[PDB]
Amino acid sequence: ANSTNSQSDLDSIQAEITQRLNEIDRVSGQTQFNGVKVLAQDNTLTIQVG
Amino acid sequence: ANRFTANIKGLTQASRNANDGISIAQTTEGALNEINNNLQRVRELAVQSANSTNSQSDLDSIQAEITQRLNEIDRVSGQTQFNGVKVLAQDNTLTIQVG
Amino acid sequence: AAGVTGTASVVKMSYTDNNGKTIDGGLAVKVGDDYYSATQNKDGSISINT
Numbered sequence A: 001a002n003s004t005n006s007q008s009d010l011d012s013i014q015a016e017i018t019q020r021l022n023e024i025d026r027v028s029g030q031t032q033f034n035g036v037k038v039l040a041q042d043n044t045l046t047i048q049v050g
Numbered sequence B: 001a002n003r004f005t006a007n008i009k010g011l012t013q014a015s016r017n018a019n020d021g022i023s024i025a026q027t028t029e030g031a032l033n034e035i036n037n038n039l040q041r042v043r044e045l046a047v048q049s050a051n052s053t054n055s056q057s058d059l060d061s062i063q064a065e066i067t068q069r070l071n072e073i074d075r076v077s078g079q080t081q082f083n084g085v086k087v088l089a090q091d092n093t094l095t096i097q098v099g
Numbered sequence C: 001a002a003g004v005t006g007t008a009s010v011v012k013m014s015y016t017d018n019n020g021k022t023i024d025g026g027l028a029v030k031v032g033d034d035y036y037s038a039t040q041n042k043d044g045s046i047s048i049n050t
Helices: A007-030 B002-049 B054-078
Strands: C009-016 C022-031 C034-040 C047-050
Touching: A007 C034, B002 B054, C009 C034
Parallel strands: none
Antiparallel strands: C009 C022, C022 C034, C034 C047
């Protein structure tokens, strides 16, 4: 929000923002339990307890 | 806890935002003061001009002094800057989030 | 081939910021308000990057 920023500094910050977002996507895609992409799709997993 | 943490970080950032705003304001005020200093002193010569007894050589000399001060005003206005920003060099509105 | 309609010419890029600072880049091709990054052929002709 700092209007003092020049376009160069704005791009500097944009760079880290983009990198962090892409890292979020990376972790979401790559996380998995025994192959279950626990962060790649809405799901409902069954666990018999009785 | 997450909500309060986010609020804390945002307020912290607003801190430095206000700090830079104050910095630019003070730079502006200092430049303003110097130009005022270099302006009223010139108006003094202008008033001196009014005397009828002056010879036109003296009138041109006083013109030279006034022009020197105008050049100095322009030079100082150009010099005045902050973090690559020239406050007196252009009309502008600057927005500093504080929330 | 792309169907771009208008005059084709080679221009050099200049950018200015809110500070008033200015910079210049390489070469490009301008059709109306559009632009395309350009590369120099060794003979002096120009090509569009893809």
